[PDB]
Design a protein around this nucleic acid. Sequence first.
RNA 1: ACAGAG
DNA 2: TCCAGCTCCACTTAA
DNA 3: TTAAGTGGAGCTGGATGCTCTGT
Lengths: 189, 512, 124, 103, 78, 49, 99, 49
Amino acid sequence: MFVLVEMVDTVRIPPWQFERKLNDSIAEELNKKLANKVVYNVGLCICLFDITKLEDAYVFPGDGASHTKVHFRCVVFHPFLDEILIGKIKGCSPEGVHVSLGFFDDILIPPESLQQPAKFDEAEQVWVWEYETEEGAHDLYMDTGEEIRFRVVDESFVDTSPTGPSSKEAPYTLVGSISEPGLGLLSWW
Amino acid sequence: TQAEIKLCSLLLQEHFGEIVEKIGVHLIRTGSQPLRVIAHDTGTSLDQVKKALCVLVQHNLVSYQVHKRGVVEYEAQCSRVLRMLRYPRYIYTTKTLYSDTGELIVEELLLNGKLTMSAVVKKVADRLTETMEDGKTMDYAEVSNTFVRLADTHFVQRCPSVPTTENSDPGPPPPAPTLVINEKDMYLVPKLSLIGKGKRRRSSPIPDDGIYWQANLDRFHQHFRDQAIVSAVANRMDQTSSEIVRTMLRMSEITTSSSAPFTQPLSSNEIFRSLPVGYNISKQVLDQYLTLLADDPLEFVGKSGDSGGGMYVINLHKALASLATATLESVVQERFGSRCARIFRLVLQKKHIEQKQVEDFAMIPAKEAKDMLYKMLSENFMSLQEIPKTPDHAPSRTFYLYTVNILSAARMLLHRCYKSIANLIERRQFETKENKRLLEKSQRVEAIIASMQATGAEEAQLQEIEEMITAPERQQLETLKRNVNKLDASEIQVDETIFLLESYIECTMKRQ
Amino acid sequence: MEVKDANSALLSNYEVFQLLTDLKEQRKESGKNKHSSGQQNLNTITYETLKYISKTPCRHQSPEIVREFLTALKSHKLTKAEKLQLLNHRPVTAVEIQLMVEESEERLTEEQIEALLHTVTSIL
Amino acid sequence: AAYTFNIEAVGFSKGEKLPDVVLKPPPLFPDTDYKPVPLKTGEGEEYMLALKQELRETMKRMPYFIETPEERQDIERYSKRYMKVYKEEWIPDWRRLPREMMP
Amino acid sequence: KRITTPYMTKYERARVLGTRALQIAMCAPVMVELEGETDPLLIAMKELKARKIPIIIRRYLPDGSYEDWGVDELIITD
Amino acid sequence: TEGRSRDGGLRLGEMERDCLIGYGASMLLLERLMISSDAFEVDVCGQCG
Amino acid sequence: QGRFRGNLSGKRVDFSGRTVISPDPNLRIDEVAVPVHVAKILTFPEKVNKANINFLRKLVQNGPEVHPGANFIQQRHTQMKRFLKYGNREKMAQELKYG
Amino acid sequence: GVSECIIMGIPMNIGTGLFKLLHKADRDPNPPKRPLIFDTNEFHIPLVT
RNA sequence: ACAGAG
DNA sequence: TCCAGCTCCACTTAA
DNA sequence: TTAAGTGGAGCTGGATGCTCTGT
Ligand SMILES: [Zn+2]
């Protein structure tokens, strides 16, 4: 479900690390700058996948470190629209249902895309669903959060960059839907 | 011309879009260029440049010529881009002289840029079906009958023709065919025996091929020039006197240059038969009018002859100088008030004048006149002569004669107009873009009514439209429309000022 | 840092399983130094991704299992985004094919859908 | 305190009534005594108002309005044929147009 | 083939010793067996005489082409 | 600062600059005339310059 | 005395000194005698590494007033400087790190 | 040029500035790539005609 | 601004 | 205290 | 006869060494 992103960078290798093969030292110094961070237009970087090319290791004047331009590919969790995923409920809230996908927690099920039978919680945090035959409106998305299946209808990037001179909002947002048949808790289908 | 290029950028974006306004503005700003560097200076791909250039040449907005070594150079026609703004006034004035068929002819010619005579009579017939009902078709005969009347009156004219390759230079194909204008056949229509009917949108080899036709924009300016002169005479003298002027100008139409100081003289003996039969005036009283017009110091008419009875000419250049001055004085009056407009007409008649004579002559005191004088310098309505006593040019020993120059103040005022329209468009587009949220929302509710209008459409959908939360919002959309309708209407009305000022500037230039 | 291709390839979750397992074989032979939080970011994202994938049915697969899965599914007129989803989630009921494949009730006949159920569960 | 220039060369022969010191800058949009002339109305000046708005809505739909091409669509799907933006294409007259502009 | 002179110029010698001294001042591995020297530039001069310096000199021709010469394969001289 | 009273320091003039160029001493001329006088950092916008 | 000649092409520099010169033939031609009063002021930043750690410790212990000594000490990723006249120098010598 | 390099604080081209130094690291350029398993061309002939 | 020193 | 450009003005050729 | 291109003469603006050492 992931993608590769082809990226370039100039990596500074300091001179105490000259006792190590360069392809090992470069990869470590790249994971330290990319892992668990969102790169704006492309998504959340998991780790470096491989180095595809490695240019000349210049030494610039006034420093002793070596600078080398690296060509590399990185595994990034970018899910395409209308994809099916499975994940666990962390919380119920008035604004909707919040889903976790392992590492990723900013998954929104909006109430405009929830199941139609029940749509306004009666002063309760937990969301509800009513079926006439079974369960009299007490069926619920439990706080323990047994895995739901959801379909990612929308995603948005918000540019979390400094405004004004210098001297926490979620930068990657994902919006699901659950209204289709076959979506929901796994035990329902 | 930074105001012109800013205004041309908006017009091309609204009528043609983003990847062609880039090429259009670049041609206006840099002048003529070969094709390869138009792409490179812009970063557009070569296929998009060809698409952009071919649409700008279709609507007659760029010319092309062959040069040394056979390269084509394109060249933008800046003034012809600005005349896209006057298009509704053209479509209205054809509806005044001609029926609704003549309105739809000019609309198709202006929107497609060039059309063949077979193509226009087709598309006018197709569109006039919506104006009629109960079986009656539009037929191609009554379309052409107005087109050939448009042609004789010179509102529509043939485009520059491709040359005959077989007669001239047979052989290797040229990079561009080096088009030329023929003076004989501009107003000579092809004869068409084919007739037919317009299709009512049910949805369930060509003889005049290459005879393209386009609107003759210079003929509309000769119409609008007449209306400015005729209406000025209607105010100052009388409606009867205005008709005498309208009679002279309508005869002048076919036999005079669109740029000349004087038209062909006409005798009062031949004016008499040309005036409509309802004007219960004797020939002797007709000569009373003509002398009292010629006595006027505004000199809209003059004598210029004595043969065949009384001979009279109407002055084209001197009427425009009056109208440009009346335009120039009217903006002074509204911006700074009547007492300042007094001083503007004072200095204009007392061609060079000093402060102590201004307060004496206008009966405006000091500390009120001088404040008005010094503002008119700083808005470039008025000038200083500064005759020196000595080659020091020192301020203590020179007499600061004021002057009004009409030509420079007309060029200055025209520059204010181009930026004024650009601002009005910028306000409309800002309020349209920042309400795309509500405009989509008000579309989608109306889309539920438009889509599935009749087939299977139950009555159970007519109340669910106002059930959305857009019903309180509606107050904003009434504010939107009243804003846009005032901004659009002001964008039309400032064009009345441009045409008066530009026609004066156009005639004083000899372009030698 | 500059990006030369945003979307380059689609990855199965088996390749990420194989990547992080090969990563784990050579990680944690040196600990975090706390000269910078950079090592903390790498550990938390690697661990939580694999703990997610280890609860997905992508385990026990292999390169020759995945390659032959495409070979069997080659003849079925499915796009990449549909073949990818059938691999990663292991469908066993009929309903999620209408989710994972658009207009499946129009493109695939009921016998073709039930052949697709068997093609998944016999190979995977 | 005196300046570099002599103030008597500018003016101020009496020795008083120097202009005051501006404390706060003047506002960006100062108030004006005069107002715009109200617009012209009529049955003819309003028909030009409606024809002007119909030329925007038409010339955006006509084939001369070359829209910018889209790019970097992520994946292919079966909703591509259902969502193909169909529009007919205009063709020029390549006699008048130069040879250098064929697509 | 490489057309430029095989001798190390005084400017190449000055900057190799400088860049190596700055690298030995930071905690880089020393390739020679040092013998109680403390001054980084003196250690770099032993590495030059022993031909152990890991620097490549990229000679630049004015058209933009280049030649990569090893410090160990230039002819050093006083 | 300018001199002994103010613990001023010494000048690398336009003539001493001409000497160091003739040695080809590019880094020493950078150390003397930037690093040990007036080294600074500015924020430069790459868009407007 | 303008920018381009007075402050840009040439400029006042620190770590500089001036004194009267006098002969000494017992020095080699590549040597110059520097007085102790200038040598105690003109400092050189020696970066701590494996070859000089035990040498610089003795210099830190002597401190500012004895000639083979040191005036300042600066920590690895810090840009403030500890003036070594105060504090106990035998503690600051023990806490030398590489870098 | 030399004079504007001293003004702007960048090392002059002449002298020791004419050449660049590369570090002789033990590196393998164009290293062995990880094969993709899924998104290879032979299994993904286009759907549309 | 002047005097010095090399 | 010494020295290149810029502009004004007479001075022949040419139609 | 005069339009014009080029000579000769006067006006204008620029420049004139490097540092410390004191009042
Ligand atoms: Zn900026």
